[PDB]
């Protein structure tokens, strides 16, 4: 009746990547949080967005160890159903909150560099905190769908899950489509458009030298592309599984094969938690000097 | 007290090579972008030659390019300007002006009508 | 006993805080400019300091002209460091050397080392007359003009004689020699050519301010 | 003549400040040190004031 | 003869220099080395006053040592309550560029001035409420640098046209004009007895004036650059000057000679603000390196650094009771140190 799955890749790769993320991204995210708070101390609107991104990431790493344990035991949650609910809600939804805050950072940067003698009501710290609260509330409300259903679906085999059923439910598939599109592609597309506009504006400047324009181009390309290289395989596999689940709920070979993929691409997704600080705070020379101070 | 006592002067035919220096005292003579300003008969104070703190960035005005050479003897506290191949274009009283501030690269007010660190000049007729 | 006094004090503080917030908005909404060197520019835009208010593209500009102060500027020029740009109106028709080192002293000041400067080179008609006829004083007080020729980067929109163009760009490069030397991204010294008949210096200063604030935003939002 | 007028004003001022009686630097510094010593106690910046009496 | 006039001037200068040399029996170091050094004087930021938008070019204390007035370039004049970090008033000035603000010794009046060549007297104790100008003083040619109150209906102003002026607010005209300087007068401080005041200008010299007599009694030439700040010694028989040569000098009015040169090879930036402590033992100085440095007036050894400002420190003043030091800088903050 169910779907048989098995993978040692899930036994080795996700715990290792998550351990690396816990090791490296936690201090970097704390440093990014401190840098963002320092920016807000200097009436910087981007500081609020960086702070919110940092706190979302920090929640993700804080809840990482229990999912490390879950993957290490060959997908057996032995910690409890309610704790499974809370830690799954924080383990997921944090990727999407971080993506939304990256989009907010990109939009702020575009509205500044492209139009430096224009709207300032939407470039105030009060507006930043209002937008941050709105984004947090909206993301939590839109991703609170699983909390009203059941979690911890035991499997006839030696498998007791936490936030995922292989046979799969219809509601989780529709939620997966909503994730893959709205929570990933829309803010990533907005970020790409914003940084494209920023690059155009920088190229249009007269006071910017050749080296600075190339540096800004490299930074923008990195910022646009690393989110893709860290998230796109996971969302691609999610879309594939959901599409063929609606195609054939009874089928199992697809899941049987892409078990390794789906859980080896969830490991990859966590690398953005360390990517965001070392890219948005450590890269800048002034913020690097501030962190060193 | 800051003092810039000039020396030199004397009528010379065109092509003269007379020169003499200042007698700067009261400051260190090593942290100032001192220069030369001469007032022409019936004309305001204009600049001719300039030297840096150590004597590296020697700059000249067009009329004195290739004619007079600036020298700054730190240990002798003299702006030892040399005027070679003098012309009847100058016929001016020469003031050894001094940069307003130490350890700085801006002579903001050197050609003004009144200036404290300018000193009394010496008329060089030609 | 002190309850009423403390309550009244907090009420007054709240009122003053609201007033200061409104003043914060109005202060950040406007940009300040210093006009140095000049009557034509302020006339076409619209006591020690002559206030001038003009609006271009729905942005309020606050240009300030010193008109009752002495020749010495080493003290009161320090106050004009937070201005968006210092509009330097050179004659560039020996006033040339005095303007050159006024610009140099502005450039190398330790408080104007972050303040951008806009150059205008006001005289063009009399420059053309002086290069066309007369004793050619341009080469007498600047002997390097003989070696210098018309640059290829120059775009001769007014199809006049080559002499006026080469002299004009000679003065421009004389200013840019000290502009570029000991000069980095802190300022740029945007060079422009203006005259009495020009009726678009407002747009030039507006675009210069746009570039300045663009660079400041790039430095401030970690986009560099 | 105007410069000569300024010169006469300068020499008149110099004559005014030439007759002024002057005390030696030794006493002119001993009195300053005495004033500094006398008022030493009533200086919170030099000697810290107890936090109870401190309004800050 | 003009040359004869210069010869007489230089002969008189040599005579006064010889007299000053004869009056230099001993140095301050020889008479001061025996006393105990003041030690490391470390004071923390007891309060920070936020609300200013631009660089703070002036501030002043009230006689009560409790009310504080600050002038900044946003065209604002905020009267703070130092104890409770409040804002009693916020006076919007017509001229944004203000370099000096004054608090009347009896309150009820606040002065301000700058590049407008005008000293504006603002009434505090109004009949009904709010704040309005009482009289506007005009006549100065150069920018006003430092204005201080003698009492009600008598103010002293320093200007950049090498002249200081004494005014009376009620009539609105000058009572006495002070001339004799060559450079722009940049700062001014009054004697405790309000009979004399010393002004330092951009000609590397400070001069002592008589308020009613109206002539310069003494001049002091020991510096080598423009003097940016002056301050009477608490006693009233000395004053300290800070200049662009990165040297602070203490001058004596009864010996018309420099007494000490508080300087170091490390400090290259000039002094922007100078203020003595209540006892005069400590000479707080505000430098352009984003720092305020607490000297010891008697022994030239430096004994304190007021770090905490990220821009140029321009204002500095000790309370009338010597309980707090407020440091106004170019970061739009008034940190109160104690």
Residue numbers in the entry:
A (entry chain R): 7 to 299
B (entry chain N): 1 to 126
C (entry chain A): 11 to 47, 53 to 61, 205 to 251, 264 to 394
D (entry chain C): 6 to 61
E (entry chain B): 3 to 340
What do the study's own words say?
Among the over 800 known human G protein-coupled receptors (GPCRs), three specific receptors — GPR4, GPR65 (T-cell death-associated gene 8 or TDAG8), and GPR68 (ovarian cancer G protein-coupled receptor 1 or OGR1) — were identified as proton (H+ ion) sensors regulating signaling within acidic microenvironments. The three proton-sensing GPCRs exhibit different responses to extracellular pH variations, and each receptor has distinct preferences for G protein-mediated signal transduction. GPR4, in particular, is responsive to protons and engages with various G proteins, playing critical roles in angiogenesis, endothelial cell inflammation, and cancer cell metastasis suppression.
The GPR4–Gs complex was then assembled through co-expression in insect cells, followed by purification at pH values of 7.5, 6.8 and 6.0, respectively. Using cryo-EM single particle analysis, the structures of pH7.5GPR4–Gs, pH6.8GPR4–Gs and pH6.0GPR4–Gs complexes were determined at global resolutions of 2.9 Å, 3.1 Å and 3.1 Å, respectively. To further elucidate the proton sensing mechanism in GPR4, the pH6.8GPR4–Gs complex structure was selected for more in-depth analysis due to its better EM density map and higher structure quality. pKa calculations of the histidine residues in pH6.8GPR4–Gs revealed that H165ECL2 and H2697.36 are the key pH sensors, with a protonation ratio of ~99.9% (HIP state, both nitrogen in the imidazole ring were protonated). In the pH6.8GPR4–Gs structure, protonated H165ECL2 forms close interactions with residues D81ECL1 and D161ECL2, and the H165ECL2F or D161ECL2N/A mutations reduced pH sensitivity, as evidenced by a lower half-maximal effective pH (pH50). In addition, the protonated H2697.36 forms a hydrogen bond with E17045.52, and polar interactions with D161.31 and D81ECL1, linking two histidine clusters within a proton-sensing network. The intracellular conformational variations result in distinct receptor–G protein interactions on their coupling interface, with GPR4–Gαs forming the largest interface area of 1230 Å2, followed by GPR4–Gα13 (1017 Å2), and GPR4–Gαq (1114 Å2).
